[PDB]
């Protein structure tokens, strides 16, 4: 259930509860960094495919949080 | 990937420049990988550019940490 400024204070749709990590999913695609309360999210997965994401879920939490880190940089 | 040199040498190394803050963009995506060091926070911006940046390049540090806030996670 959600992390909003009410319970449905989101931007993209059509997603479910729980996936897993038994080989891949890689990149996330969120939107416009200054348009929405939030803006919206896409996940690119399990033999290069896409999913969307707002507003109550863990796997994504951890994904954001996991994705974040892999590697480091400035211009490299 | 972290602090690097040469005329491009690690999984992403394209983007290479100067935008101090966050104010307005098109879309931002973190890590198009599944397999190596490969990724960053790629930023799509206001009559273009597309950048590959993360951890070491501050403005991006803060960007991900500034924008995080803005987009969500799924269903319950």
Curated annotation (Swiss-Prot), chains A, B:
Chain's gene name: CCL7
Organism for this UniProt entry: Homo sapiens (Human)
Coiled coil segments of this chain: none
GO cellular component terms attached to this protein's record: extracellular region; extracellular space
Impact upon substituting residue 22 to A: Decreases binding to Link domain of TNFAIP6
Family, as annotated: Belongs to the intercrine beta (chemokine CC) family.
The protein's name: C-C motif chemokine 7
Residues of the full protein shown: 24 to 99 of 99
Modified residues (Pyrrolidone carboxylic acid): 1
Cystine bridges: 11-36, 12-52
């Amino acid at each position: 259930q959600p992390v909003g400024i009410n319970t449905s204070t989101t931007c993209c749709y059509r997603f479910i509860n729980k996936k897993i990590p038994k080989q891949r999913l890689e990149s996330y695609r969120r939107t416009t960094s200054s348009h929405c309360p939030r803006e919206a999210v896409i996940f690119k997965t399990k033999l290069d495919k896409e999913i969307c994401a707002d507003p109550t879920q863990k796997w994504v939490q951890d994904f954001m949080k996991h994705l974040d880190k892999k590697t480091q940089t400035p211009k490299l």
